[PDB]
Design an enzyme around this catalytic site. Structure first.
Site, PDB file in Angstrom:
ATOM      1  N   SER A   1      -8.230  13.789 -35.405  1.00 31.02           N
ATOM      2  CA  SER A   1      -7.517  14.563 -34.372  1.00 31.02           C
ATOM      3  C   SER A   1      -6.023  14.328 -34.430  1.00 31.02           C
ATOM      4  O   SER A   1      -5.597  13.227 -34.760  1.00 31.02           O
ATOM      5  CB  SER A   1      -8.026  14.192 -32.989  1.00 31.02           C
ATOM      6  OG  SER A   1      -9.347  14.647 -32.749  1.00 31.02           O
TER       7      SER A   1
ATOM      8  N   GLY B   1     -11.294  10.909 -35.120  1.00 33.66           N
ATOM      9  CA  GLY B   1     -10.268  10.024 -35.662  1.00 33.66           C
ATOM     10  C   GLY B   1      -9.225  10.799 -36.434  1.00 33.66           C
ATOM     11  O   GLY B   1      -8.099  10.333 -36.597  1.00 33.66           O
TER      12      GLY B   1
ATOM     13  N   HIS C   1      -4.943  15.760 -26.472  1.00 37.88           N
ATOM     14  CA  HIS C   1      -6.179  15.025 -26.138  1.00 37.88           C
ATOM     15  C   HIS C   1      -6.161  13.559 -26.600  1.00 37.88           C
ATOM     16  O   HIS C   1      -6.889  12.747 -26.028  1.00 37.88           O
ATOM     17  CB  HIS C   1      -7.446  15.734 -26.636  1.00 37.88           C
ATOM     18  CG  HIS C   1      -7.866  15.460 -28.045  1.00 37.88           C
ATOM     19  ND1 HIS C   1      -7.809  16.446 -29.005  1.00 37.88           N
ATOM     20  CD2 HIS C   1      -8.472  14.371 -28.574  1.00 37.88           C
ATOM     21  CE1 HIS C   1      -8.314  15.914 -30.101  1.00 37.88           C
ATOM     22  NE2 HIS C   1      -8.736  14.667 -29.889  1.00 37.88           N
TER      23      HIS C   1
ATOM     24  N   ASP D   1      -3.996  22.122 -27.157  1.00 36.32           N
ATOM     25  CA  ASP D   1      -4.144  20.771 -27.712  1.00 36.32           C
ATOM     26  C   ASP D   1      -3.001  20.485 -28.685  1.00 36.32           C
ATOM     27  O   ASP D   1      -3.172  20.482 -29.907  1.00 36.32           O
ATOM     28  CB  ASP D   1      -5.522  20.600 -28.365  1.00 36.32           C
ATOM     29  CG  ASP D   1      -6.053  19.166 -28.393  1.00 36.32           C
ATOM     30  OD1 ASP D   1      -7.116  18.947 -29.000  1.00 36.32           O
ATOM     31  OD2 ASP D   1      -5.401  18.266 -27.793  1.00 36.32           O
TER      32      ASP D   1
HETATM   33  N1  LIG Z   1     -15.995  18.997 -36.863  1.00 36.69           N
HETATM   34  C1  LIG Z   1     -14.679  18.759 -36.800  1.00 36.69           C
HETATM   35  N2  LIG Z   1     -13.860  19.121 -37.784  1.00 36.69           N
HETATM   36  C2  LIG Z   1     -14.171  17.951 -35.767  1.00 36.69           C
HETATM   37  C3  LIG Z   1     -12.791  17.904 -35.488  1.00 36.69           C
HETATM   38  C4  LIG Z   1     -12.288  17.038 -34.508  1.00 36.69           C
HETATM   39  C5  LIG Z   1     -13.171  16.215 -33.798  1.00 36.69           C
HETATM   40  C6  LIG Z   1     -12.677  15.362 -32.806  1.00 36.69           C
HETATM   41  C7  LIG Z   1     -13.543  14.517 -32.107  1.00 36.69           C
HETATM   42  C8  LIG Z   1     -14.919  14.528 -32.361  1.00 36.69           C
HETATM   43  C9  LIG Z   1     -15.419  15.383 -33.350  1.00 36.69           C
HETATM   44  N3  LIG Z   1     -16.731  15.433 -33.602  1.00 36.69           N
HETATM   45  C10 LIG Z   1     -14.557  16.229 -34.079  1.00 36.69           C
HETATM   46  C11 LIG Z   1     -15.036  17.107 -35.063  1.00 36.69           C
END
Ligand SMILES: N=C(N)c1ccc2cccc(N)c2c1
Ligand code: NA
Length: 246
Positions: free
Chosen positions: A198, A196, A46, A97
């Site tokens: 990710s 961020g 992603h 992913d």
């Molecule tokens: N709540 C999470 N741990 C999490 C993990 C990855 C994410 C990626 C993009 C946007 C988010 N809100 C995310 C939350």
């Protein structure tokens, strides 16, 4: 990373900082990654699916800060950007992913292991830690959901693995979270990964050895009640990683 603590690359030497060069020359942070072998960084599809040009990306190893050239850091270009063929994104859930980045210096070399640049072991098949195991996450992701900037200094936190049965509960994610995904969160909902983070690692100590158990993938908001972080279960993808790194 919401909560947790500031850290440096010497504590997470497998952590890869992935940036994208834009038209005009501006460079922005994209996602985290993990060094699984000197030529290979593992991250999430992603992060790259909308800009799948390997030429656009910059990969750093041994880097502790978002805008500092950390002593001993190494900079790389992407020789090969491998995205999982069956990747897809629903409203929340991200499927398959996982991505591989073959890294190369301008001299045409792979990473040189050092005190601040090291690989992270891959997990073994059908051997993931049990629910309740404490695992660590690392990233340059948001410190708060309302932030629009990323922290300058690398962060880390510790979260606990959540069973698939618990994560499939209606107030959690229901049938949207699959057996190819792993949930992890803070029982008090104060600390978590966020936007961020990710592509970054979820490292678990199992049978005394530290392994790349998960890859930061998705979650409903950040550090929200009954909304764990969802991670790519790396042990499911071992045949795909082995076949795509040959
Ligand atoms: N709540 C999470 N741990 C999490 C993990 C990855 C994410 C990626 C993009 C946007 C988010 N809100 C995310 C939350
Ligand atoms: Na930046």
């Amino acid at each position: 990373i919401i909560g947790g603590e500031f850290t440096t690359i010497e504590n997470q030497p497998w952590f890869a900082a992935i940036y994208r060069r834009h038209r005009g020359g501006s460079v922005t942070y994209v996602c985290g990654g993990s060094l699984i072998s000197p030529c290979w960084v593992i991250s999430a599809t992603h992060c790259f699916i909308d800009y799948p040009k390997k030429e656009d990306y910059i990969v750093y190893l041994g880097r502790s800060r978002l805008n500092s050239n950390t002593q001993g850091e190494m900079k790389f270009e992407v020789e090969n950007l491998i995205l999982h063929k069956d990747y897809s994104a629903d409203t929340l859930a991200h499927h398959n992913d996982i991505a591989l980045l073959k890294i190369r210096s301008k001299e045409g070399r792979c990473a040189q292991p050092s005190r601040t640049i090291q690989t992270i072991a891959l997990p073994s098949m059908y051997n993931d830690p049990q629910f309740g195991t404490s695992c660590e996450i690392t990233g340059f992701g948001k410190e708060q959901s309302t932030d629009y900037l990323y922290p300058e200094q690398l962060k880390m936190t510790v979260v606990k693995l959540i069973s698939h049965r618990e994560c499939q509960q209606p107030h959690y994610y229901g049938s949207e979270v699959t057996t190819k995904m792993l949930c992890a969160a803070d029982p008090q909902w104060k600390t978590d990964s966020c936007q961020g983070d990710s592509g970054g690692p979820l490292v678990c100590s199992l049978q005394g050895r530290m392994t790349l158990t998960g890859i930061v993938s998705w979650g409903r908001g950040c550090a929200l009640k009954d909304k764990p972080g969802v991670y790519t279960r790396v042990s499911h993808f071992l045949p795909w990683i082995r076949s795509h790194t040959k």
